[PDB]
Amino acid sequence: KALPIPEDQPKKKRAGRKFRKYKEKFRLSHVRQLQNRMEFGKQEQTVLDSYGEEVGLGMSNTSLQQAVGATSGSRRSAGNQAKLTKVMKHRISEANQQADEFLISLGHN
Amino acid sequence: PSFLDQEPPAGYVPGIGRGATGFKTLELKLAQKKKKRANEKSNVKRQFADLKESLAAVTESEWMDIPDATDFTRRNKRNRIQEQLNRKTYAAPDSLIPGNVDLNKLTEEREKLLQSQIDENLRVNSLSDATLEDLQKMRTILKSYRKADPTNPQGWIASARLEEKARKFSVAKKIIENGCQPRSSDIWLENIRLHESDVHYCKTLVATAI
Amino acid sequence: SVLLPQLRTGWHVDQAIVTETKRLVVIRFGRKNDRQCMIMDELLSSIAERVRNFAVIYLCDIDEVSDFDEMYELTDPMTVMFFYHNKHMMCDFGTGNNNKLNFIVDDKQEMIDILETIFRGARKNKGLVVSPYDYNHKR
Amino acid sequence: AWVSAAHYNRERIKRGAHVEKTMVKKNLGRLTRLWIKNEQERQRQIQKNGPEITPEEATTIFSVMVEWLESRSFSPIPFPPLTYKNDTKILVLALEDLKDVYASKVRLNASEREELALIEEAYDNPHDTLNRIKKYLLTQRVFKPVDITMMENYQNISPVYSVDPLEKITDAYLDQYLWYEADQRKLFPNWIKPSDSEIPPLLVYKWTQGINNLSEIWDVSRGQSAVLLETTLGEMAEKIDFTLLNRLLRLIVDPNIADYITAKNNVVINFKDMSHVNKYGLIRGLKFASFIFQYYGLVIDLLLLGQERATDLAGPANNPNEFMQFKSKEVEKAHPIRLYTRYLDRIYMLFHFEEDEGEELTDEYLAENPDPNFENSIGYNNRKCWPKDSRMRLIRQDVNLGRAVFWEIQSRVPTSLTSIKWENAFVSVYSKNNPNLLFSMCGFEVRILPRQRMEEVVSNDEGVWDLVDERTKQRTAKAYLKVSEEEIKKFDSRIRGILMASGSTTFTKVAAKWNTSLISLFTYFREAIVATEPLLDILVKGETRIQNRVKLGLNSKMPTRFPPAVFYTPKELGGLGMISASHILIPASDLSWSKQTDTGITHFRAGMTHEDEKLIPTIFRYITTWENEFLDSQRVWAEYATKRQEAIQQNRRLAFEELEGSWDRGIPRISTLFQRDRHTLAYDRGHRIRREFKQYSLERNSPFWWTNSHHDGKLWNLNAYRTDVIQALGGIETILEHTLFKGTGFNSWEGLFWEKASGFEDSMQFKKLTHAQRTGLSQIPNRRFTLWWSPTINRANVYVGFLVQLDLTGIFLHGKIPTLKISLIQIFRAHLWQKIHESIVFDICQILDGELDVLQIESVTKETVHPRKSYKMNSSAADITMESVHEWEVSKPSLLHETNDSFKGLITNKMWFDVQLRYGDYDSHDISRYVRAKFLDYTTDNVSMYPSPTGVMIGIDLAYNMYDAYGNWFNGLKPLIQNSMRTIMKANPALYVLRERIRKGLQIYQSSVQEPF
RNA sequence: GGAGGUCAACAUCAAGAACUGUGGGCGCCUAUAGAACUUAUAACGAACAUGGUUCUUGCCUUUUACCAGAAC
RNA sequence: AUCCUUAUGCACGGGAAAUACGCAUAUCAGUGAGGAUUCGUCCGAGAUUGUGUUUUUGCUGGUU
RNA sequence: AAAAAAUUAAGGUAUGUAUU
């Protein structure tokens, strides 16, 4: 089965309310862009990862939040939030529903 | 591949037609010399060859009726599923910047929720400490605030308290003493708690507000 | 190997370059017995199907047709030479000869990128392209 | 061919011989296929022959546990009740420990997202998820197939098991429950230990101190001896057999769980096309696996010691002993075994013999294995590491004790459980004949000498510890350390991995690896690295290998030198930031730095100060030795205890101000006492074991497996190193000269930021792209690191070779440098180089053309330009021609910012100008010399065309924004041109094209407010 | 016939005892080929250079360059 | 005549998802697809196989 | 009257149109 072609196709645009909502998954949000800013001539804030490798979180805090080390809630973009696949979504609910039946038995027995 | 079939040229040179661009006694003696040197100076097939003779027997009908394309691992199906699984990616959510998590908020926030459900049924140690340059920034701003009001100790205790969290010790304890200079109760209250450690000093501080 | 067809006269070479308007024409110049001209003959044959939509492949032997030896200057076991609209294409693999190809490429994937790169750059009339991976060290 | 060639290449890569990038990738696959074939063969033959444990064998095993638990008075662990106090605390722990894998990621794999979403729902519906878990523990006994992948450590190819995520959550919950309840009921005694309280190198300290403290081990006055054992229990997990396992778990737990644990290990394991059910072994990819391994180890270790001795080591259930102690000296001296520990597999046993007891054990072995040829010492394993003087001596008396003692212990443990062989076991003896007691814990090789027998030759070492008896309080022994010959070969392989794994990565990613790997290595082995000669040699070799990788990408040919500033400047100033272990010369020629002020152009060189030269500081200072840390903690902890007493004694709580003095001190560290989440971390237990077993569940090399910084705190601070390295290269100023920073046009660097190239690569992978597009975008972060350091990399000194010119520019290239040919060719497009010249010419006309009057000038005429003049170098011609009302008073040709000017020298007519454009290197960024030399050559050059022999060249550096002019002077020029050039260079449109066009290439920016307007 | 031929062509080329095969002459003798053992590789040349392969040391992991050991 | 129930069709208004939705001169399939089990029994419709698109389908508007 | 050398080379081709 054959690779399509490497020729480029003119870029098409649309964006409604609906298509913004879907795309929001696939773009680095605001807060996440500020990690790509590295402020020059001074060391990054880094927090070590579970693994212990340090994760630089660049400008994601304001220079007054560094010095007090507050960290910033800022604005949290709900749009990307991870959500279940279709297959997986019922297997949880179905498991849960079946489980409730089980508990009742022990409730009455 | 239609041309592949045809077989005939004009009596034609290859380079020219396309429009191409490029980007005897001694001999005899040499040959003789070479000869004067030649004079002086597989396994796999053997292993198999013996089988190949074995084949000769097989009939032409059987050669035809040979099954043609048998897959036994279902490679195609697995490969397609793998491509589908690996296609796109996704961006990781913004809850995941590593700074925020405190367990104690987390358990208290949760356990309560769990309890409610039941009823219905019925700083980070990772983080690097403040850089000197950045801390300096804070100091300037707080100094400006303090200068803006020589009164209003609300800006005085902040310079003690904000400073205290970031650094504390020598600095804050000197400021809380400086801005203490009579009326405000709040400054006095602040001063004793940070400054006091020792009882005599605490007492002396108390003699201030009183 | 029997997958990929062979070109038995220099007149089969030239028509084959002309008649394919829309795709690369890739040719391996080298002779059956060679150690390295057998290896490439594999790495191409595996790839030829995947790429049928933008590239066409053929096989030629220096001994079968020696007409082309001086003009393109062919030395060593084999040379891979890319053609699009009769225009000899050209790429720098970091190896120090921008014409053709010599060394044996290692992965199937890194071979498909090079074909794809050449085609894409070529489509725009560009005469040089850059191989993303530069095997000067390799060869 | 396929099988043999697969083994043959593997040993080649074990060696560090170079086999190419592609082969190493394929070889892992082939080895994984062979290992799975062997696993499939191991299991098919346990169908035929049945379980190997034999009923008679089993009773002996099972009986030991039954007595132990009853002796110890052990209540079994119940089933987790529907209403349970800690369900919250144990979910949060368990889910966050599943969560933290994804905390480093900007982007998620499609599966990763599924698991992430699943945890969220767990927090959102805690009541609902707990019930689901409980019901699956009660009933689900069929599970979804597990998948296998293989790590390559380049040495040991290991399995990695990926489970399904709904089943992960019960397993995590279950694992957390079992560890919390287990250690709350005191199942596992002192001696099983990759335990919570101690970091592995702290454990090695405790063990050697415990060895010292036991009374009179040292005195060989009366034929006494002593022995250690190190035995890999061999296949353990791979031999665990279930029909026994179910029974043993029933013993310590309620069946409903035990049944689940036994069932979860069947599964059906897929690797690509192959599939086999796991009947026999234990799968170690499951969360509770850690607990099972410790329980099976506790079976084995009641065989070795026996109940009689094991109660001596452990102690009564009312007052269990600390790690190495007993109650009385009498209880110590009862049995030959004195100390015992087990770390996962490996066992350590110390034995104390006296000839009376000693001769017996020797003789019995001899009788049952007679050796007339004295062949015992053929197959005996020394520690290779140490010199002949220090190893094990091979003497008949002692070589028989080792083989006697080991042969005793093979006898205790039946071959069904495990496989203990001689080969994998090392034995040491301390007797009259052998002064040295040798063992390896973790990857430490230790020897001990007592001060008693020191006389046999010694040289002190960096790793030395002095060991103190609690009574004498003196120094009766010493300890030398060395890094095991394993853990050195891990490193060598891991570094090759960096250079192998990357066909294309950045320069920054590579030097980011080499930090993490080196930093792990130093922190673990602190003292020892300085004592190991081959390891040190590799570190020096490693660093250059990385550098050579960098250099080859930058240019094919290789340079005589690359300044040390490139590699060792920190990430922010635009360097790789890589740390250094080695000696590196910062040549004093490269410290030179020049700045411009409206007064003039000042230079700085500290080269003329002749003292010790400047060297790039190295890690060996910055990390304190392991000794000092424990020596502090004892005192630190005591101080803390005292302080705790003191506040409540006054009815007051501890103030930070007291302990603000010591935070970073003490191995747990004080900070963790005052961490906010400490309240709920007390329910997370067995954490040290999990981290060791995170190997198996997932594919990342986790160089820090020996710490949770949540429990331990932060164990090293390399902040001090960052500043020091900047200072060694001479401050930010000396650095930036080597950069294009001055050709950006910024005055100062306070408000500036970089746009990182890491996340830059992310925005480009959210589009649909082919592979060839996809690789093309991984090079872009390399192309920025050339410009920013382009002025040093392009110089005559570095690349020798022959100069060439960009086709419409005055920039020369020493090499090919394929990525700096491109970036420059864009930075000047549409004949930008010419335009700059013309703009500057315009400025000087419209400066002078207005000023005909004041300077008394009869004409100002900007001449024709042969289009190619601007960029070509060798010959020049005049541009702007000046005239006079009468004539002029010239001076001695001189430089702009000079003061002393006398015009009496000549009286002559008319003037010309050249505005000359240079883009300089680091070698000469001073135009002063250049301008004057060019002027002199041009005035006296025959080919050069000038109206008069009176003129003023104007040199300009586009690179550093430097300017100067060497003039023939008249009243009202110097005071004019100086004021003009300030407004010329800080205005023109042609320059403001470059300086904006360049600061795209570097992706430097300015900001005040981030928040979108 | 003889010496010498800075003339060529064609064969061989360390020595020795012992085994097998072929040919010639009257079991013996002579010649040629193969295998084994010894001498010391007393040297066909009191001289000694380059290259290929396979291994082992250094390497930019590249050469129409090499470092210095091994065997063929 | 009002009222009420189920199915199907067009439809205002409100949500969720596109790793999802289909297609086949193609194999079987309540004459039992595919699962669960406390081991006594219990649910009952799709599973293979090849393929098309899937960070997007059509359509407008601004600003340069 | 205190001291300079003993290391070499390829991996460096701008397309593209027009004229010959």
Ligand SMILES: *OP(=O)(O)OP(=O)(O)OC[C@H]1O[C@@H](N2CN(C)c3c2[nH]c(N(C)C)nc3=O)[C@H](O)[C@@H]1O
């Ligand atoms: O609505 P309309 O008056 O047009 O109905 P029709 O004229 O079509 O005629 C006869 C049908 O009337 C219905 N009715 C009318 N009434 C008053 C009535 C009807 N049906 C019942 N039941 C059968 C319970 N009860 C009534 O009081 C019927 O459909 C007649 O067929």
